[PDB]
Design a binder for this molecule. Sequence first.
Ligand SMILES: OC[C@H]1O[C@H](O[C@@H]2[C@@H](O)[C@@H](O[C@@H]3[C@@H](O)[C@@H](O)O[C@H](CO)[C@H]3O)O[C@H](CO)[C@H]2O)[C@H](O)[C@@H](O)[C@@H]1O
Ligand SMILES: OC[C@H]1O[C@H](O[C@@H]2[C@@H](O)[C@@H](O[C@@H]3[C@@H](O)[C@@H](O)O[C@H](CO)[C@H]3O)O[C@H](CO)[C@H]2O)[C@H](O)[C@@H](O)[C@@H]1O
Ligand SMILES: [Ca+2]
Length: 562
Amino acid sequence: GRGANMPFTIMEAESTSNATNGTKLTPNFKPGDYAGEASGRSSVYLDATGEYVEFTLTSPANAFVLRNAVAENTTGTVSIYADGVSKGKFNVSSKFSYLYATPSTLGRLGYDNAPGAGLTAYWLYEDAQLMLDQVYPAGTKIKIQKDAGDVSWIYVDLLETENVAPPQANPDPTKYVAVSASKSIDQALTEFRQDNTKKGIYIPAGEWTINSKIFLYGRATEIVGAGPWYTKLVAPQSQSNTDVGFNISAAANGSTIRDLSAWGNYINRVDGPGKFIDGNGMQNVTVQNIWVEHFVCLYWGVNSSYNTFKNNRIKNTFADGINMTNGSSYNVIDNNYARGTGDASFALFSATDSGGSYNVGNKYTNLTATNVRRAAAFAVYGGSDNLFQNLYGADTLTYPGITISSYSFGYNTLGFGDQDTVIDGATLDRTGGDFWTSVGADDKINEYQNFGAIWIYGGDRAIKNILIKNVDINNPVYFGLMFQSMSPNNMVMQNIRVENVNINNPSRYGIKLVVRAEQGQGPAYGGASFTNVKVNNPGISAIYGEAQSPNFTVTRVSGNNW
Ligand SMILES: OC[C@H]1O[C@H](O[C@@H]2[C@@H](O)[C@@H](O[C@@H]3[C@@H](O)[C@@H](O)O[C@H](CO)[C@H]3O)O[C@H](CO)[C@H]2O)[C@H](O)[C@@H](O)[C@@H]1O
Ligand SMILES: OC[C@H]1O[C@H](O[C@@H]2[C@@H](O)[C@@H](O[C@@H]3[C@@H](O)[C@@H](O)O[C@H](CO)[C@H]3O)O[C@H](CO)[C@H]2O)[C@H](O)[C@@H](O)[C@@H]1O
Ligand SMILES: [Ca+2]
């Protein structure tokens, strides 16, 4: 009931509703582990010819996405059956998975694709997409099976199913110049610009190369596809880390991109390039119903305002999904789905290194973000008057479900401003995790620093006016809520409120006031108010750190069972 409303249905392979003659992993929360990195922290291991997982369709489907893990540096197949009749072969491959690092060098996570001595493999799961020539009814038994000739072994994590409409044709051949076998995207855009009666271009079903950053200028431009399953923009797969996509300047304010998919060719993170859409001051641009993969980001906006991001799918990128800096204001990020982003899936960063003030007035609504391969599902870094509402986040590999931080990351930065940053209506399932190193740390349980479902981090910038309300935190890895001040700046927390929050079976505490994260770090400064904040069945205590935090005040307004 919370998050994005998407046309596809996700079914976990390990659900005991599904018959299998293979191996269900028992869950853990461990990076670089096939259960830890899986959706729902488990998957079904198919290991020998004839092993299968049998799903039952709850909704008709003609298209299927298998999130899976196969061996490093292999491509192959796994079989799919409909009611016991074999119907195709998924094309599975570890070409975009397996990024290498070390427990002590987790800052390199996402950047290094080559195996080497002493390196652990992370980011183990990738996706295979398959469309079948039949719409199958609900109640169909869809069997994922390892036949002779299929890959040696495979971890089956989940299957999304979708009933995909037929491809939409050119809305009007007189108003949209058509990409074709003889006409490239670039050429169609030239003809559009040069003929004032055209509203833009139509990209039809098929696979179209994008080896370029396509700049949209001149006037508001409409870029329309036949559907994400049918219109595929394809970065050249023979190459790697090719910066392609769209750049939308202010000349093309009011432009539209919709109903297509873009398949990148990145195999590791690169900082600078790699965004599918570049927003430099763009305004009133609508990005709608696109499906992006294997880019660094879907979108990175710079001082772009009044834009709409609606119904998109962001899967398997190497850094953020959607992020915005430099006074990017009054944008609507509504009804988007993210899975397997390589950094925070949905974020707002008030960086001012390009002459912009606060990110203000933005709305991040009906969002779903799972399997965050690094950092948080939702991250808010400074800003003012920004709303995060009706969110579902789950299975972060390393970090909180929600990060609220005034840390500059080394840039010219504004902290939180005069109006509340609000987080209203969130469900976070199995969020938090392990990252960085915990040398000299208090409350030390392992090699790493441990992160609660929600992290309130005072950095080197002001941290104030934060309202967290109507949040359900189910089985966090460690804590529900975690308050932490960076030393030595010791920025004081004012006007933090937590209302109607349930923390269900946190393994350690429901509330952790960080006392010494690291050598050189001290307790948190400021305070926070608590109303109807319920901690149910903690592992150790309901709240940790109160007595050791003399510079932090806990205001128990009412309703608190701790
Ligand atoms: O305005 C800051 C710069 O943004 C771009 O750089 C990004 C990098 O800084 C980095 O961003 C981090 C990001 O992933 C996020 O989750 O956490 C931090 C704060 O929210 C960010 O610092 O990596 C991103 C992906 O490669 C970069 O997009 C611009 O390219 C750069 O010119 C700006 O200076
Ligand atoms: O995955 C989180 C981000 O990683 C990178 O940014 C780093 C900062 O988050 C930060 O990390 C600190 C870490 O070194 C250790 O000291 O713990 C601190 C808190 O307990 C962390 O805040 O600082 C580093 C230097 O600026 C950054 O390397 C990526 O740049 C960013 O994209 C990620 O979102
Ligand atoms: Ca699973």
